[PDB]
């Protein structure tokens, strides 16, 4: 009995299967993250990603920033997280513009791990990527706003 | 050609990051570009010479403008041996208050750099006296660059 | 079989390992909400322009209207100017 096996049975594809890679807990969790919802409209997945990340970025900017100890503007240091959402959204946009042309099909895999034919994720299309970028921007600005809306009754404001 | 660098098909067909790097480092070696001729060589060099001259004029024009607009020139002419000349002003949002204080010198309203190029002594020696003269110079040089 | 000249995606491991392929867990009305509101940002070129000009003018705004209580560089020096080694 051995825990490590080749990836999907093929020992000459360069990888391995471990509790870290192929595990029911891990496979379910990764499968239930927005990026891995291949049939969903990329705009909604971008909404979720942007909401989570934009919400996250507020913390370090406010607590570690230069105005951190001037509580009058230190709280308002969330503008910086907003600006980073802007810059990241630029990076996404030029990534898609550079990566996908107008009429090209998805570059995502069209097979499953078990060999059956799959429909490829539209995220890897020019239109799908543009939708994911718009969703990440909207959700990101929105998540920053939501985090900034809560200044109260938290052990680390 | 088909992509950057357009002057080298062997570099554009490189799938590695090298293609970018060598596109930059070979941009001026005209003799090694695709389909180069002697005529194209000389003409590209000639135009590049005009471009260099324009850069030089624009640069000196900038120095003139900054001495006139942020510098000590008029005050420096009256006391050459006790006025530190001013290159230009410092607007850096990373400064703490101590930097704003310590770099504010030469008899100026904010932080400045002291010039060590010696353009004050030169322009003073050749007859320039007012910031107005310096502005006329700077606009003349911007014109020459154009 | 792990080698098939007919299907190389399987032969070369071109799979979606963690792709769910399940239907949307996002309920509608939420979906239509974000689909109608994030729609103007789904044109990538237009979004690029809106981000560069919007963020650029935003930056210009907070830079032009900054207060000395925030930036020492606008506050300017508040001390009497010192004296140089030999000069002013």
């Amino acid at each position: 009995y051995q825990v490590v096996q080749p990836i999907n049975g093929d020992p000459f594809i360069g990888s391995l299967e471990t509790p870290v890679t192929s595990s029911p807990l891990v496979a379910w969790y990764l499968s239930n993250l927005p990026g891995y919802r291949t049939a969903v409209n990329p705009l909604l997945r971008g909404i979720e990603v942007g909401l989570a990340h934009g919400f996250l970025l507020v913390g370090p900017f406010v607590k570690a920033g230069p105005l951190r100890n001037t509580e009058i503007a230190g709280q308002a240091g969330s503008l910086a997280a907003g600006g980073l959402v802007v810059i990241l959204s630029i990076c996404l946009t030029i990534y898609g513009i550079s990566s996908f042309n107008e009429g090209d099909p998805s570059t995502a895999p069209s097979l499953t791990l078990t060999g059956r034919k799959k429909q490829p994720d539209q995220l890897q299309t020019a239109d799908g990527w543009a939708k994911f970028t718009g969703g990440f921007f909207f959700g990101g600005i929105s998540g920053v706003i939501w985090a900034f809306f809560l200044l109260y009754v938290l052990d680390l404001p | 050609a088909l992509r950057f660098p357009r002057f080298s098909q062997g570099l554009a067909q490189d799938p590695t990051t090298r293609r970018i790097w060598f596109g930059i480092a070979t941009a001026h070696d005209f003799e090694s570009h695709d389909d180069i001729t002697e005529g194209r060589l000389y003409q590209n060099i000639f135009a590049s010479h005009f471009g260099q001259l324009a850069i030089i004029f624009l640069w000196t024009s900038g120095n003139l403008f900054h001495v006139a607009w942020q510098g000590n020139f008029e005050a420096w002419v009256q006391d050459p041996l006790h006025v530190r000349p001013i290159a230009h002003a410092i607007w850096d949002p990373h400064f703490g208050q101590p930097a704003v204080e310590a770099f504010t010198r030469g008899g100026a309203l904010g932080p400045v750099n002291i010039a060590y190029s010696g353009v004050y002594q030169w322009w003073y020696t050749i007859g320039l006296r007012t910031n107005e003269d310096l502005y006329t110079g700077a606009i003349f040089l911007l014109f020459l660059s154009f | 079989v792990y080698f098939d000249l007919e299907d190389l995606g399987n032969t070369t491991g071109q799979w979606d390992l963690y792709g769910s392929d399940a239907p949307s867990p996002y309920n509608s009305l939420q979906s239509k909400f974000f689909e109608t509101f994030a729609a103007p940002f789904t044109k990538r070129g237009l979004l690029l322009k809106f981000l560069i000009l919007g963020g650029g003018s935003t930056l210009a705004y907070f830079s032009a209207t900054a207060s000395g209580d925030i930036l020492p560089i606008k506050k300017g020096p508040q001390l009497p100017p010192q004296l140089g080694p030999r000069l002013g």
Binding site: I90 | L2, W91, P93 | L59, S63, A64
Partner: peptide, 30 residues
């Protein structure tokens, strides 16, 4: 006042635009 406009203009906006644009030109395929 003017440095508060042009320092972020050429130190933030101009490098972002130039880097993005050059990125696009450099990644283009004809």
């Amino acid at each position: 006042n003017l440095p508060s406009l042009f320092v972020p203009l050429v130190g933030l906006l101009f490098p972002a635009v130039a880097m993005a644009s050059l990125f696009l030109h450099v990644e283009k395929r004809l």
